[PDB]
Short mmCIF file of the C-alpha atoms (twelve columns), coordinates in Angstrom:
data_MODEL
# 
_entry.id   MODEL 
# 
loop_
_atom_site.group_PDB 
_atom_site.id 
_atom_site.type_symbol 
_atom_site.label_atom_id 
_atom_site.label_alt_id 
_atom_site.label_comp_id 
_atom_site.label_asym_id 
_atom_site.label_seq_id 
_atom_site.Cartn_x 
_atom_site.Cartn_y 
_atom_site.Cartn_z 
_atom_site.pdbx_PDB_model_num 
ATOM 1   C CA . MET A 1   2.262   5.898   -11.266 1 
ATOM 2   C CA . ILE A 2   2.064   3.898   -7.986  1 
ATOM 3   C CA . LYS A 3   1.014   5.839   -4.841  1 
ATOM 4   C CA . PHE A 4   3.762   4.511   -2.542  1 
ATOM 5   C CA . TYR A 5   2.821   5.301   1.070   1 
ATOM 6   C CA . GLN A 6   5.692   5.186   3.601   1 
ATOM 7   C CA . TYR A 7   6.815   7.090   6.746   1 
ATOM 8   C CA . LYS A 8   10.177  7.783   8.489   1 
ATOM 9   C CA . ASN A 9   13.465  5.750   8.370   1 
ATOM 10  C CA . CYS A 10  11.946  2.260   7.858   1 
ATOM 11  C CA . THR A 11  13.871  -0.659  6.252   1 
ATOM 12  C CA . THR A 12  10.592  -1.900  4.637   1 
ATOM 13  C CA . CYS A 13  10.148  1.499   2.867   1 
ATOM 14  C CA . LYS A 14  13.811  1.302   1.651   1 
ATOM 15  C CA . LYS A 15  13.278  -2.330  0.428   1 
ATOM 16  C CA . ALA A 16  10.127  -1.443  -1.553  1 
ATOM 17  C CA . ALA A 17  11.472  1.881   -2.968  1 
ATOM 18  C CA . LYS A 18  14.725  0.072   -3.994  1 
ATOM 19  C CA . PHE A 19  12.805  -2.841  -5.646  1 
ATOM 20  C CA . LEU A 20  10.479  -0.498  -7.634  1 
ATOM 21  C CA . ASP A 21  13.622  1.513   -8.632  1 
ATOM 22  C CA . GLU A 22  15.407  -1.826  -9.387  1 
ATOM 23  C CA . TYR A 23  12.826  -2.773  -12.068 1 
ATOM 24  C CA . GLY A 24  12.562  0.891   -13.269 1 
ATOM 25  C CA . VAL A 25  8.956   0.990   -11.946 1 
ATOM 26  C CA . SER A 26  7.727   4.533   -11.100 1 
ATOM 27  C CA . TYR A 27  6.217   5.387   -7.669  1 
ATOM 28  C CA . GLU A 28  5.022   8.394   -5.569  1 
ATOM 29  C CA . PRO A 29  6.834   8.602   -2.113  1 
ATOM 30  C CA . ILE A 30  4.081   10.108  0.139   1 
ATOM 31  C CA . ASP A 31  3.801   9.718   3.948   1 
ATOM 32  C CA . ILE A 32  1.020   7.521   5.421   1 
ATOM 33  C CA . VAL A 33  0.278   9.789   8.481   1 
ATOM 34  C CA . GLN A 34  1.289   13.204  6.993   1 
ATOM 35  C CA . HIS A 35  -0.778  12.343  3.859   1 
ATOM 36  C CA . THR A 36  -3.356  9.926   5.407   1 
ATOM 37  C CA . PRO A 37  -6.138  8.787   2.948   1 
ATOM 38  C CA . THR A 38  -9.662  9.828   4.100   1 
ATOM 39  C CA . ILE A 39  -12.503 7.292   4.797   1 
ATOM 40  C CA . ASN A 40  -13.582 7.926   1.167   1 
ATOM 41  C CA . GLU A 41  -10.042 7.331   -0.255  1 
ATOM 42  C CA . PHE A 42  -9.771  4.014   1.667   1 
ATOM 43  C CA . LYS A 43  -13.219 2.595   0.622   1 
ATOM 44  C CA . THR A 44  -12.381 3.634   -2.994  1 
ATOM 45  C CA . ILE A 45  -8.964  1.836   -3.167  1 
ATOM 46  C CA . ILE A 46  -10.457 -1.251  -1.381  1 
ATOM 47  C CA . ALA A 47  -13.489 -1.387  -3.768  1 
ATOM 48  C CA . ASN A 48  -10.917 -1.152  -6.648  1 
ATOM 49  C CA . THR A 49  -8.046  -3.462  -5.501  1 
ATOM 50  C CA . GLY A 50  -10.197 -5.788  -3.369  1 
ATOM 51  C CA . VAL A 51  -7.560  -5.619  -0.580  1 
ATOM 52  C CA . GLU A 52  -8.366  -6.877  2.942   1 
ATOM 53  C CA . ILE A 53  -9.313  -3.884  5.125   1 
ATOM 54  C CA . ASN A 54  -8.109  -5.866  8.237   1 
ATOM 55  C CA . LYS A 55  -4.519  -6.335  6.807   1 
ATOM 56  C CA . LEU A 56  -4.396  -2.494  6.347   1 
ATOM 57  C CA . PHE A 57  -4.288  -2.236  10.174  1 
ATOM 58  C CA . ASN A 58  -0.828  -2.237  11.829  1 
ATOM 59  C CA . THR A 59  -0.496  -5.971  12.725  1 
ATOM 60  C CA . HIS A 60  0.698   -7.946  15.875  1 
ATOM 61  C CA . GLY A 61  3.182   -6.431  18.389  1 
ATOM 62  C CA . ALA A 62  2.077   -2.834  17.623  1 
ATOM 63  C CA . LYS A 63  -0.822  -0.433  18.609  1 
ATOM 64  C CA . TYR A 64  -3.346  -3.121  17.406  1 
ATOM 65  C CA . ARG A 65  -2.969  -4.837  20.852  1 
ATOM 66  C CA . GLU A 66  -2.033  -1.646  22.831  1 
ATOM 67  C CA . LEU A 67  -5.443  -0.063  22.031  1 
ATOM 68  C CA . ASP A 68  -6.848  -3.650  21.817  1 
ATOM 69  C CA . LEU A 69  -8.742  -2.779  18.571  1 
ATOM 70  C CA . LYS A 70  -9.324  -6.534  17.772  1 
ATOM 71  C CA . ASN A 71  -12.167 -6.737  20.397  1 
ATOM 72  C CA . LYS A 72  -14.106 -3.824  18.748  1 
ATOM 73  C CA . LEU A 73  -13.178 -4.757  15.095  1 
ATOM 74  C CA . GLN A 74  -14.907 -8.189  15.445  1 
ATOM 75  C CA . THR A 75  -18.299 -6.389  16.125  1 
ATOM 76  C CA . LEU A 76  -18.206 -2.957  14.279  1 
ATOM 77  C CA . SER A 77  -18.725 -2.208  10.532  1 
ATOM 78  C CA . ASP A 78  -15.906 -2.252  7.910   1 
ATOM 79  C CA . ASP A 79  -16.829 1.471   7.455   1 
ATOM 80  C CA . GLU A 80  -15.727 2.163   11.086  1 
ATOM 81  C CA . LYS A 81  -12.463 0.260   10.333  1 
ATOM 82  C CA . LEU A 82  -11.841 2.715   7.406   1 
ATOM 83  C CA . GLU A 83  -12.541 5.617   9.838   1 
ATOM 84  C CA . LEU A 84  -9.915  4.322   12.374  1 
ATOM 85  C CA . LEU A 85  -7.327  4.113   9.536   1 
ATOM 86  C CA . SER A 86  -8.289  7.726   8.568   1 
ATOM 87  C CA . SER A 87  -7.975  8.802   12.256  1 
ATOM 88  C CA . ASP A 88  -4.341  7.542   12.338  1 
ATOM 89  C CA . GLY A 89  -1.882  6.831   9.488   1 
ATOM 90  C CA . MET A 90  0.260   4.845   11.988  1 
ATOM 91  C CA . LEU A 91  -2.877  2.651   12.517  1 
ATOM 92  C CA . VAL A 92  -2.533  2.016   8.763   1 
ATOM 93  C CA . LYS A 93  0.360   -0.087  7.409   1 
ATOM 94  C CA . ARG A 94  3.175   2.452   6.859   1 
ATOM 95  C CA . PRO A 95  4.591   0.247   3.944   1 
ATOM 96  C CA . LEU A 96  1.705   0.427   1.398   1 
ATOM 97  C CA . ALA A 97  1.754   0.883   -2.395  1 
ATOM 98  C CA . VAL A 98  -1.643  1.377   -4.152  1 
ATOM 99  C CA . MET A 99  -2.178  1.986   -7.908  1 
ATOM 100 C CA . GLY A 100 -5.817  2.051   -9.067  1 
ATOM 101 C CA . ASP A 101 -6.965  -1.613  -8.841  1 
ATOM 102 C CA . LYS A 102 -3.442  -2.917  -7.880  1 
ATOM 103 C CA . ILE A 103 -1.832  -2.877  -4.346  1 
ATOM 104 C CA . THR A 104 1.024   -4.342  -2.174  1 
ATOM 105 C CA . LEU A 105 1.246   -4.315  1.679   1 
ATOM 106 C CA . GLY A 106 4.615   -4.699  3.460   1 
ATOM 107 C CA . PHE A 107 7.809   -6.258  2.014   1 
ATOM 108 C CA . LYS A 108 7.082   -9.310  -0.158  1 
ATOM 109 C CA . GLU A 109 9.045   -9.740  -3.439  1 
ATOM 110 C CA . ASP A 110 6.182   -12.220 -4.124  1 
ATOM 111 C CA . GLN A 111 3.477   -9.482  -3.952  1 
ATOM 112 C CA . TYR A 112 5.701   -7.027  -5.944  1 
ATOM 113 C CA . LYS A 113 6.209   -9.480  -8.887  1 
ATOM 114 C CA . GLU A 114 2.549   -10.623 -8.705  1 
ATOM 115 C CA . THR A 115 1.079   -7.077  -8.700  1 
ATOM 116 C CA . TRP A 116 3.647   -4.613  -10.218 1 
ATOM 117 C CA . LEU A 117 5.977   -6.768  -12.381 1 
ATOM 118 C CA . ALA A 118 5.498   -9.345  -15.229 1 
# 
């Protein structure tokens, strides 16, 4: 089934878990920081799904600007990006659902129908 990464009382996690449940689609509710993928696990799922490694970072408004990672990410290797995501599961997108070569980030009904459904 789908490896549905989440963490804590988040509306996005409730939206995704409800929508998967809504279509009878099976998932695995595991935490993103408590059960953070290693550097290996990340480069595997990204070589499989072909997902953008940069969208896996927690986007605007959050720690991305606090730590100011953007300035180092524009010069380092995509390997070192994987390592940062492995160093913190909160640095990863807390709403993630990966399943072999299929994946959805955040709440989009669009991504859910495009990837999981039909």
